[PDB]
Design a protein. Structure first.
Lengths: 32, 39, 287, 548, 40
């Protein structure tokens, strides 16, 4: 298949986006 | 200064295991502590 | 039976009473009464605490004056609202938390009246910010200890969460009494009115901070910062040398220019920028 | 017939008594294991641990010899272990109408009437366990005794059993006596009515009932009444994807950490298996921010419930959070793996669970053993080699005296989890269709809350599911099919206890024959048998097998 | 035009995967060292 090769690969862009925001939160939370 | 801070983020690696104290020495601390409270 | 899941709710003011009266009379084991609001077999609440004056010279839990707890019990009765005597306390000064042989007898006199009186230990000396050491306890039956029957019938994963101190394990701890988990009753209304009311500078940053001596003090750091920078022209020159953990064990007698330097850089920085901007708002705001 | 068809397909008792037939024909257990766990005779949790362990490994098999071995050590502990004892009988007699009243004829509350009102009190609990999702005489017989009884010493069993049997029905009259069970203002009826109050209203979003529940859970002084409703208002909404968000934000906004925790359960149940962004930002965000540890533990234990569709992603993100400063987030991290990847033998997840027992906190050492049990049920040494690496480990931690009771409680629990039903039952939050198994979902979410009620995680029998094909030609007649497989027969490995005081791949299998879901593809169809399947054999369960 | 169109997206998304992955690997170790300082 080729049709899943783009949708399931932007799926991990949505999955990828949250994590830098997460370590962004823990970056201050481990300080305070 | 700030570029010497942003470029200082390439050495941080291989910081794998942060052992708190131990496990078996904690168990022997519980045993000897239990003996000292037993006395 | 109890379920080792008691979860004492207390207060916000009673802890302040405990540290004040337990602190001002520090070397003597001071005490007092706890006038709370009794609820069910599971939980118990104590909202108010009034202390008791001492008997004489001597560190002890002592006795009670039921004249004094009578009229003092009737004192707020005629003014505020009635409550119920739910417990009592004392104050180990520098000890930790347990029940002494003196403490367990006056505990035994107080559980006989109501079975859910509470022995409370405060220790306001081993506390710094996130510490209170309010490990409150209550007796367990030595009769059942002679029976060898294990008490308190754990039905909830709420009791064995905190780990006991070894000094209480030296004392009674689990042979005469039991531990109790607590929390703190907070609201919105008190949190703001302490938060906005603790350290508020009034008009201080709208000043100039000793306008002759701001720059003079700025000299008074830079002048020795020069020779400390000569130490920074001294300490670099023993690199490519013996194994810088040796440069860690070895610098324990004489100061390093590095940390001492970046101290003074920050001090001069925050010293200058604040006076710089605060000098300039007034030129616009004042005409 | 076609008139009898709605009976044949809507009662569905030819999976109930036929998987019960599979349990009475298929039972692979041990007594020697419970003899090894017999050694810890003390008045700790150990009594309830063992008597919930044999109920965990004897689900629906009706085997009364592990209980009928004794009465003194069984009836040694009291006041809730007898409640748990009369609780545990229904999972053993699960899925069978007849042996519900007649074996509990000793345990009627008006025949013997002992000093233990829980031994005669928690019976209707177990009737609800047998006839969960079976609404009949259990409703009215477990309704009229609830009209007139004692206090919450039988009302726990009748209330939880009645909402359990009437789970997700909205019959509105069980909601009525759950209102008068609700407004008792009693801390001990809070557990009785708070959970069933959501159970009968599962997925119903009756906003006036929401208004009654969250309206009532704002002014009471006790917390168990604040806790049964905390899961109930999560349970009233189920898989809505947007329709709860005002309520999620409302519960999250309030200063009550129990209510914010309940908002985390509610956003956990409104996004089941759904990899949504709006859930994963703030659901994980709070897990940073909030100061109570309970809401953090549920906040990280929502991740497998919202992300069990793909188990490939939670070991990538929760491994990052197994090294938190607090053992609460370290604990709910391990249970987040344990609810995420439990359907598979994920080598990465076992790799993450390996150093989790090394932590100096007893309950995260415990939850490492729970997740270590859930990862590898019905998996024998060829899916992953850590099975026998851990069989010595649970025995290693249960045969020590100097370990914690709370630490080894995950081991004695993990035995009945690990050897459950004679290696015939398993967990499945997921059908082959792509649809989830919502009593397994509610059973595992309710299975999380063994904290504040120990037989609360006894509600797990809705998660135990078969892995077995069944051949059939008519409504009733068993065929005699003898098919085989093709691949490596070491996949067909057994527990095989050791009992200390030339390779056939043609596995001939009858109609009550277990088969691994990985082994669903490696089989061979019966090509020379008289019975030949009209259906392409892909799923287990019950299928047609045409006599040709 | 499925060749010149649909395959023209896999060539682009991968570039975001490569460097945002690298930034993530930087930032999680960044947190790691501090987390070791907290536990220690
Ligand atoms: Zn004292």
């Amino acid at each position: 298949d080729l049709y899943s090769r783009y949708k399931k690969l932007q799926q991990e862009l949505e999955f990828l986006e949250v994590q830098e925001e997460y370590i962004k939160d823990e970056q201050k939370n481990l300080k305070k | 200064h700030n570029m010497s801070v942003k470029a200082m983020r390439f050495p941080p690696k291989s910081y794998n295991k942060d052992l708190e104290s131990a496990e078996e020495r904690r168990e022997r601390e519980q045993q000897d502590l239990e003996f000292a409270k037993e006395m | 039976a109890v379920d080792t899941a008691e979860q004492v709710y207390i207060s916000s003011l009673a802890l302040l009473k405990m540290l004040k009266h337990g602190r001002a009379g520090v070397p003597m084991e001071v005490m007092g009464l706890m006038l709370g609001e009794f609820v069910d077999d599971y939980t118990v609440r104590v909202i108010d605490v009034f202390a008791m004056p001492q008997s004489g010279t001597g560190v002890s839990v002592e006795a009670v004056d039921p004249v004094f707890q009578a009229k003092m019990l009737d004192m707020l009765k005629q003014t505020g609202r009635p409550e119920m005597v739910v417990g009592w306390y004392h104050s180990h000064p520098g000890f930790g938390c347990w029940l002494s042989g003196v403490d367990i007898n006056t505990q035994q006199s107080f559980e006989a009246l109501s079975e859910r009186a509470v022995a409370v230990v405060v220790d306001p000396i081993q506390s710094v910010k996130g510490k209170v050491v309010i490990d409150a306890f209550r007796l367990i039956n030595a009769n059942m200890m002679v029976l060898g029957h294990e008490p308190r019938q754990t039905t909830s994963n709420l009791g064995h969460l905190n780990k006991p101190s070894i000094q209480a394990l030296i004392h009674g701890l689990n042979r005469h009494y039991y531990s109790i988990t607590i929390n703190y009753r907070k609201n919105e209304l008190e949190q703001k009115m302490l938060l906005n009311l603790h350290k508020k500078s009034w008009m201080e940053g709208l000043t100039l901070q000793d306008y002759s001596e701001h720059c003079k003090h700025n000299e008074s750091v830079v002048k020795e910062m020069l020779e400390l920078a000569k130490n920074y022209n001294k300490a670099v020159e023993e690199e490519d040398k013996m194994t810088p953990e040796q440069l860690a064990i070895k610098n324990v007698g004489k100061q390093d220019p590095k940390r001492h330097l970046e101290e003074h850089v920050d001090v001069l920085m925050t010293s200058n920028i604040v006076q710089c901007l605060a000098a300039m708002l007034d030129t616009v705001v004042f005409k | 017939d076609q008139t009898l068809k709605m009976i044949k397909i809507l009662s569905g008792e030819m999976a109930i008594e036929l998987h019960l037939q599979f349990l009475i024909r298929n039972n692979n257990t041990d007594l020697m294991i419970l003899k090894n766990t017999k050694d810890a005779v003390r008045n700790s949790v150990c009594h309830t641990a063992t008597v919930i362990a044999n109920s965990f490994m004897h689900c629906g098999t009706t085997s009364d010899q592990f209980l009928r071995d004794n009465l003194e050590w069984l009836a040694r502990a009291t006041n809730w272990a007898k409640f748990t004892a009369t609780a545990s009988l229904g999972v053993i007699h699960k899925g069978h109408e007849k042996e519900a009243l007649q074996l509990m004829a000793t345990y009627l509350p008006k025949d013997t009437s002992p000093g233990s009102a829980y031994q005669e009190g928690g019976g209707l609990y177990a009737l609800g366990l047998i006839h969960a999702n079976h609404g009949g005489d259990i409703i009215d017989y477990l309704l009229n005794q609830l009209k007139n009884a004692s206090n919450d010493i039988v009302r726990h069993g009748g209330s939880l059993g009645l909402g359990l049997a009437a789970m997700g029905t909205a019959r509105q009259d069980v909601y009525d006596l759950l209102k008068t069970n609700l407004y008792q203002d009693d801390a001990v009826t809070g557990e009785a009515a708070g959970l069933a109050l959501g159970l009968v209203m599962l997925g119903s979003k009756n906003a006036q009932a929401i208004e009654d529940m969250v309206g009532y859970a704002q002014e009471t002084q006790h917390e168990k009444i604040l806790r049964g409703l905390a899961v109930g208002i999560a349970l009233v909404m189920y898989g809505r994807m947007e329709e709860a968000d005002a309520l999620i934000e409302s519960l999250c906004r309030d200063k009550d950490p129990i209510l914010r925790r309940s908002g985390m359960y509610t956003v956990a149940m409104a996004y089941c298996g759904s990899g949504n962004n709006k859930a994963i930002r703030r659901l994980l965000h709070v897990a940073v921010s909030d100061v109570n540890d309970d809401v953090r533990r549920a906040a990280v234990e929502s991740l497998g419930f919202i992300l069990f569709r793909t188990p490939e992603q939670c070991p990538s993100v929760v491994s990052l959070l197994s090294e938190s400063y607090n053992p609460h987030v370290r604990y709910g991290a391990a249970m987040a793996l344990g609810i995420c990847c439990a359907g598979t033998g994920n080598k990465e997840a076992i790799n993450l669970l390996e150093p989790m027992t090394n932590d100096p906190v007893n309950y995260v050492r415990q939850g490492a053993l729970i997740a270590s049990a859930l990862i590898m049920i019905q998996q024998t040494e060829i899916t992953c080699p850590k099975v026998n690496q851990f069989r010595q480990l649970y025995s290693k931690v249960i045969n020590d005296k100097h370990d914690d009771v709370m630490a080894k409680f995950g081991a004695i629990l993990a035995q009945g989890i690990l050897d459950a039903g004679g290696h015939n039952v398993t967990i499945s939050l997921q059908s082959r269709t792509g649809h989830t198994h919502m009593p397994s979902v509610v059973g595992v979410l309710v299975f999380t809350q063994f904290w504040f009620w120990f037989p609360l995680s006894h509600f797990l029998s809705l998660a135990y599911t078969p892995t077995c094909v069944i051949g059939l030609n008519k409504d009733l007649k068993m065929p005699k099919v003898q098919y085989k497989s093709n691949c490596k027969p070491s996949t067909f490995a057994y527990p095989a206890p050791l009992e200390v005081p030339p390779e056939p791949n043609f596995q001939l299998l009858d109609n009550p024959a277990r088969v691994m879901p990985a082994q669903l593809k490696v089989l061979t169809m019966p090509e020379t048998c008289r019975y030949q399947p009209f259906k392409p054999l892909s799923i287990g369960g019950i299928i047609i097998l045409k006599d040709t | 035009g499925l060749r010149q169109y649909y395959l023209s997206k896999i060539e682009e998304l991968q570039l975001i995967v490569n460097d945002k992955s690298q930034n993530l690997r930087r930032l999680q170790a960044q947190r790691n060292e501090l987390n070791a300082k907290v536990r220690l």
